Amino acid sequence: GIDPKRFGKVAVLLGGDSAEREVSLNSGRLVLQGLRDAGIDAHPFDPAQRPLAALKDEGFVRAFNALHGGYGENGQIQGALDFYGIRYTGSGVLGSALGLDKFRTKLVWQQTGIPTPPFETVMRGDDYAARAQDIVAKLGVPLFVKPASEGSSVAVEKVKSADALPAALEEAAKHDKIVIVEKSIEGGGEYTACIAADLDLPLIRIVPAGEFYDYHAKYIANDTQYLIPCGLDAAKEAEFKRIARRAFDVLGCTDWGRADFMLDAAGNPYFLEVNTAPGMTDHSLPPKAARAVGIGYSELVVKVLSLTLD
Ligand SMILES: Nc1ncnc2c1ncn2[C@@H]1O[C@H](COP(=O)(O)O)[C@@H](O)[C@H]1O
Ligand SMILES: [Mg+2]
């Protein structure tokens, strides 16, 4: 119950130049309506088409970031907004940049007791056959080969056989100077924990129809399931929500986003990444998690924006 005047003049950052301009336009237009439904003085601002300095010059005090990919997510616009004195939703420079770097995220997690798949690295110019032998010996198969980060050119690959690993390594190393090779977490399920301020949001179980939550399962298929309830017992659900929040916090992220994790057959969790720029379309996961606990869309957006006060 915040007087919408306390928010002042608000920009919704949407659109941009990235390959995810269209999810951002969709999300941002809805966010904008959510804020205006609450009587907040909100206005769209597409940084690809307006000069960024206009945020300061036109007197905007804060921004709801609905950008996705590139400068909108990686710390670059975060830094510029801090430089221009504009408060914004989501994580600051370090958290944003670190969240997109799966290598350094996993190092920090390993040092701070956040569970994450065992992994090795391969560098461009390595003896890929030699590295493959050593990695299989340590981790077995299957393996996930992914950018250290991140997703730029070469899609995540599940390697099922030792003899296929050298080629997968060489190809991944052509498009990132650091490649992560993780043990495949098998025999459980896949989950995500949405984080929004102190809201108690339920876990979601992600059930791809195919091998893993690949591009096809995310963007092509209409049959990926996003399940609430997630199927876990109350104690485990509480435990994993707590670890998810610590996993975000230790990276310097602040509490808007999602933490993604796998369970093995024994029910142990292994975190894969954080996402500091989740979607806000009417089919996106944070609005679903919020609606499951009685929080509607406009309420959710207002709550996220409230974290920029004080
Ligand atoms: N180590 C892993 N074990 C099991 N599944 C994984 C692992 N890494 C990635 N995946 C799957 O691949 C998808 C995309 O990987 P990523 O973008 O790195 O999270 C994940 O959402 C999971 O479905
Ligand atoms: Mg993304």
Author numbering: 3 to 312
What are the paper's exact sentences on this?
Burkholderia pseudomallei is a serious, difficult to treat Gram‐negative pathogen and an increase in the occurrence of drug‐resistant strains has been detected. We have directed efforts to identify and to evaluate potential drug targets relevant to treatment of infection by B. pseudomallei. We have selected and characterised the essential enzyme d‐alanine‐d‐alanine ligase (BpDdl), required for the ATP‐assisted biosynthesis of a peptidoglycan precursor. In a similar manner to that observed previously in other studies, we note a paucity of hits that are worth follow‐up and then in combination with a computational analysis of the active site, we conclude that this ligase represents a difficult target for drug discovery.
A recombinant supply of protein supported high‐resolution crystallographic and biophysical studies with ligands (AMP and AMP+d‐Ala‐d‐Ala), and comparisons with orthologues enzymes suggest a ligand‐induced conformational change occurring that might be relevant to the catalytic cycle.
